[PDB]
Structure formats: C-alpha cells, structure tokens
C-alpha cells in the first residue's frame, strides 16, 4: 500500500526514465542494422528487456549495461535474424508482441510469441499482415501466437480508420515485403517508427516504405518519456510554490496531447531525429476546458483528469479505444472518493473542479492510475491511500522533488 502527504512545494531538476516506445524501436531496428549502435537512455524496465531477450534468442548481439542505461548492439543485417530455440516471451509487453509479429511474419522460420495481454486482441494487425502473405495462428488465447514465417511477403496498400500501433507493425513487415507497402490514415499518429527508420538511414515516403533497403547503425540517445514527465508536470502545476525542470524530455508533437491540454487550462509550462527539450514547470491555477477528441490519441491521460479536478470550472470531453475508457472509469471512481464531483459519459467524461480531499482510492493494480493519485496526493487536504517494477522508481524520483509517497 502507498500513502501520501500534502507537498510543501516541488522543486529541483530531474531526468525521467527513457521513452518506452522509442526504446522498443531503437533496439529492434539496431539489432538488424549494419554496424555497431550504442543506445543511451534505454528504459531498463521488464518490457524493454523482454524485447532484448527475444532479439537475443534470434541471434542478436546486444550488451546490456543495466546500471548505465546503455546497450551496445552489433547489428546482424537485414537478413541476419535466426530461428529462436524457444518461444519468445514478451512478458507483459503488448508492444513487443505487436512489433515482433510485424518483424517476424516475413522471416524464413517459425516463431511462437508467448506472454502474461489476453484482454487485448490483435485482429487489427493480423488482418493486414495476412494480406501481405503472413500465415499467423491466433486461435484460442492470444498470446500465444504462432507465426509461420513467409520469406516471400508482398507489399500492400492498407487503409487505417487513426492507429499508430498497426502502422508501426506494418512498417516493420514492409522492410521484409517485396515492393512498396503504403499506410494511409485519416490523420497523423505517433511516428516514432518513421523517425527511427530515418535515424537508421532507411528511406521513407511521406507513408510508404519499400522492402529491399538496408538499416545502417547510428548511435542514439533515448529521450525521456514525456508520458512519465506528465505526472511531474501536473504535480508542479497544482502545488503552490513549485518550480521544477525536467531535463531531456522528448517533445514529439504526436505525444504532446497532455501538455497542449494543460496549456489550454493555463498551466505554466516552459519548453526550452527525435525532438528533445528541457521543460520547466511552475505552479499555476487552471480553468476547466472542452477537451478536443483529436488530442487524446496524442497512456498519461488519467493524470490530466487530476489537473481538471483542481481547476475552476467544468472540464469536459465528448466523443476512443476501450482500454482508455476503462482507465477513465477508474479515475471517476477515485476522484469521487476524494470529494470531487466527477461523472462518466458514454461519449467521454465530465469533471467539475473543486477541492481534493484526503482518503482512499482503488488503483486497480494499474501503475498509471496509482501515479495519477500520487500526484493528487500533493494537493489533497489530507493523506491519500492507494492499494496498488517502475512505480518504485517513480516513488524514489517523486520523493526527491517534494512529491511525498510512502509505500507503507
């Protein structure tokens, strides 16, 4: 159990842990490039290391210097991946299972993808991979997935009615498809895959990628995870006398949703192949807003709801994926317990700003939810108790900047 006590003000400079999505893509692309790549700021979490283990099972040369957050990867070339002796265990990483599916569909061997993920189905990536020539067995529970490598995939044009997960997977398959693979979508979506492809010298057309190119090694620094940054950003925003600076945080437009929304509420957020920046945040009073639906697709959203809880006025969004709709429900419950008049809507949510109270909330064993209520704990009139890996690191960092969190 995690307890909090009202913060007397956040201050100082901190680095947040490396970006998870970029870490995933950096090691996977580096593994098959030509030459040596050094990865700095690699998120040494369980998920990211599950990806490293899978790649090592397929002949990838990767040194893990866990204490320094570095990887020294010796690429094996686009055609250098080899049949793994056993199932690839993706543990809890729904990203690993999706990217590997895209990477492996077109190899000349069979693979089994295993993991802890069954709530999240993946017909959205299997359908298009199958059109490219993939033979994937996804019957019963998924995971596990059986992939019957098809070393003769063919490029396809595929229409996506705003999903970066599918686009990432298909760009990966496209490296191993004959011809061009083109993905068109209604509006831009996270483009970390496109960026790292360009970082490793592969050419793109903006998006189409062609099978037949060659990834070349190129050192990379993983920017801080703006999704992690967001919690400190909101903490600093709502807590009197706070002024903090988050160093080297990635500020890719496709990930700035929360920052954009906080700015509209009146937050004081100074933002000084992947754009990275320093972010300085100072306490500020917020107003409620109408949240535009196109800003949600740009994981951290739960903590924005905290910012809404302490603003003056009503905050509302009308017109989403199920995963987030579930997280919203968890926030509405928790806020209710802390004296906040919140209410779920079939199309979104409606929060009336007021005054956080001390109390108890249920985190639903979700680190993002627990983190969000830790942030609320900074301003809550009394201790907030939470019944919730990365959160212990979150705890150490929080305490260092004046956000009080005791796992006792």
């Amino acid at each position: 159990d995690y307890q909090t006590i009202p913060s007397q003000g956040l201050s100082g400079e901190i680095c947040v842990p490396g970006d998870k999505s970029i870490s995933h893509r950096a090691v996977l692309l580096a593994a098959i490039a030509e030459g040596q790549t050094q990865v700095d700021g690699f998120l040494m979490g369980a998920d990211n290391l599950a990806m490293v283990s899978a790649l090592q099972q397929m002949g990838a040369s990767i040194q893990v210097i866990e204490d320094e957050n570095i990887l020294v990867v010796e690429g094996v070339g686009m055609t250098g991946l080899q049949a793994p002796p056993e199932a690839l265990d993706c543990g809890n990483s729904g990203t690993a299972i999706r990217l590997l599916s895209g990477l492996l569909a077109g190899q000349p061997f069979n693979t089994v993808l295993t993991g802890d993920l069954q709530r999240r189905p993946m017909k959205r990536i299997i359908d298009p991979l199958t059109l490219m020539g993939a033979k994937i067995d996804s019957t019963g529970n998924v995971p596990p997935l059986k992939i019957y490598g098809n070393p003769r995939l063919t490029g396809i044009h595929y229409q996506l009615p705003a999903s970066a997960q599918v686009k990432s997977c298909l760009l990966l398959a496209g490296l191993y498809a004959r011809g061009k693979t083109c993905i068109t979508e209604p509006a831009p979506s996270r483009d970390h895959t496109e960026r790292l492809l360009k970082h490793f010298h592969y050419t793109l057309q903006k998006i189409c990628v062609s099978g037949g190119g060659k990834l070349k090694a190129n050192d990379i620094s993983i920017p801080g995870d703006i999704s992690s940054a967001a919690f400190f950003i909101v903490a600093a925003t709502i807590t009197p006398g706070s002024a903090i600076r988050l160093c080297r945080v990635g500020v890719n437009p496709t990930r700035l949703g929360v920052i954009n929304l906080l700015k509209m509420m009146g937050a004081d957020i100074e933002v000084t192949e992947e754009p990275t920046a320093d972010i300085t945040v100072r306490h500020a009073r917020l107003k409620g807003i109408d949240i535009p639906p196109d800003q949600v697709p740009l994981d951290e959203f739960p903590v924005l709801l905290i910012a809404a809880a302490v603003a003056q006025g009503k905050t509302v969004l009308r017109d989403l994926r199920v995963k987030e709709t579930d997280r919203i429900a968890a926030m509405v419950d928790g806020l209710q317990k802390l004296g906040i008049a919140a209410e779920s809507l079939p199309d979104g949510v409606i929060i009336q700003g007021g005054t956080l109270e001390g109390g108890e909330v249920n985190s639903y064993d979700d680190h993002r939810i627990a983190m969000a209520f830790a942030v609320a704990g900074t301003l809550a009139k009394g201790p907030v108790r939470i019944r919730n890996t990365s959160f212990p690191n979150f705890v150490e960092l929080a305490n260092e900047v004046g956000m009080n969190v005791k796992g006792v």
Side-chain angles (χ1 to χ4, degrees), residues 68-112:
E68 298 180 43
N69 290 332
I70 291 174
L71 300 172
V72 178
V73 184
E74 195 63 49
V76 310
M78 303 303 295
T79 71
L81 286 187
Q82 313 214 86
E86 54 177 21
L88 308 175
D89 192 1
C90 300
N92 214 257
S93 184
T95 287
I97 197 171
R98 290 184 308 266
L99 304 182
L100 291 170
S101 286
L103 180 64
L104 304 181
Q107 306 300 325
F109 52 77
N110 300 332
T111 292
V112 173

Side-chain angles (χ1 to χ4, degrees), residues 34-50:
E34 182 151 312
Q36 171 161 110
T37 290
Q38 184 168 313
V39 188
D40 286 293
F42 183 74
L43 181 52
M44 295 291 182
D47 292 352
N48 297 103
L49 294 177

Side-chain angles (χ1 to χ4, degrees), residues 7-11 236-244 281-285:
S7 170
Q8 315 175 265
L10 283 69
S11 69
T237 298
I238 71 181
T239 305
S242 300
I244 63 173
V281 186
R282 279 166 277 242
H283 164 64
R285 299 182 198 286

Side-chain angles (χ1 to χ4, degrees), residues 57-344:
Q57 284 216 94
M58 293 177 300
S61 174
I62 303 178
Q63 291 180 229
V64 180
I65 308 176
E66 191 161 333
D67 305 69
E68 298 180 43
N69 290 332
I70 291 174
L71 300 172
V72 178
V73 184
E74 195 63 49
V76 310
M78 303 303 295
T79 71
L81 286 187
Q82 313 214 86
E86 54 177 21
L88 308 175
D89 192 1
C90 300
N92 214 257
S93 184
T95 287
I97 197 171
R98 290 184 308 266
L99 304 182
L100 291 170
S101 286
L103 180 64
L104 304 181
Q107 306 300 325
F109 52 77
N110 300 332
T111 292
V112 173
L113 299 190
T114 241
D116 301 343
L117 301 182
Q118 297 173 348
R119 264 297 194 178
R120 316 164 72 171
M122 40 207 296
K123 143 186 276 298
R124 287 199 193 275
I125 77 174
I126 293 168
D127 290 347
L129 287 177
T130 301
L131 290 171
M132 301 180 60
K135 325 99 143 52
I136 295 166
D137 178 356
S138 64
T139 45
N141 290 356
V142 49
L145 276 190
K146 276 102 159 199
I147 297 174
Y148 299 97
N150 179 353
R152 296 194 297 191
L153 291 192
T154 51
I156 70 174
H157 188 119
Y158 196 70
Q159 203 174 351
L160 281 171
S163 186
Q165 283 172 182
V166 183
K167 189 225 303 167
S168 294
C169 169
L170 300 184
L171 294 165
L172 298 185
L175 301 182
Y176 296 96
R178 198 181 175 103
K180 270 190 203 295
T181 302
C182 293
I183 319 289
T184 63
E185 41 179 18
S189 51
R190 312 176 210 106
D191 63 7
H192 297 290
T193 310
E194 296 88 312
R195 310 221 182 198
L196 276 53
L197 287 175
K198 292 163 187 284
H199 172 90
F200 288 103
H201 299 103
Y202 207 84
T203 88
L204 292 167
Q205 298 190 343
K206 212 271 253 49
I207 30 55
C208 301
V209 70
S210 283
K214 177 171 303 189
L215 294 170
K216 317 265 199 164
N218 188 192
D219 292 337
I220 177 168
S221 285
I222 311 302
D225 199 322
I226 196 184
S227 302
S228 308
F231 294 86
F232 294 92
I233 285 168
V234 176
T237 298
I238 71 181
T239 305
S242 300
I244 63 173
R245 178 167 58 251
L246 299 160
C247 303
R248 299 307 144 190
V249 175
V251 294
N252 178 328
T254 53
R255 298 284 300 287
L256 290 178
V258 165
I259 294 190
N260 300 338
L261 298 179
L262 293 176
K263 278 172 183 283
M264 294 178 193
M265 322 211 310
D268 180 4
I269 301 179
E270 157 183 311
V271 178
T272 290
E273 203 68 60
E274 275 288 346
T276 179
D278 293 353
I279 304 169
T280 307
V281 186
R282 279 166 277 242
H283 164 64
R285 299 182 198 286
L286 310 174
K287 286 178 187 288
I289 53 171
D290 286 336
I291 305 168
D294 65 33
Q295 213 64 205
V296 182
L298 305 183
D299 191 46
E300 54 270 10
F301 187 73
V303 80
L304 179 76
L305 292 187
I306 296 306
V310 304
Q312 60 187 248
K314 291 180 182 170
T315 309
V316 194
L317 98 164
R318 289 183 273 116
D319 310 16
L320 284 187
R321 162 174 290 181
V322 61
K323 188 184 180 186
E324 195 63 293
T325 296
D326 191 356
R327 270 166 174 164
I328 292 179
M331 293 309 296
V332 179
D333 174 7
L335 288 168
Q336 221 99 70
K337 278 63 181 291
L338 308 176
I340 304 302
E343 175 180 27
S344 195

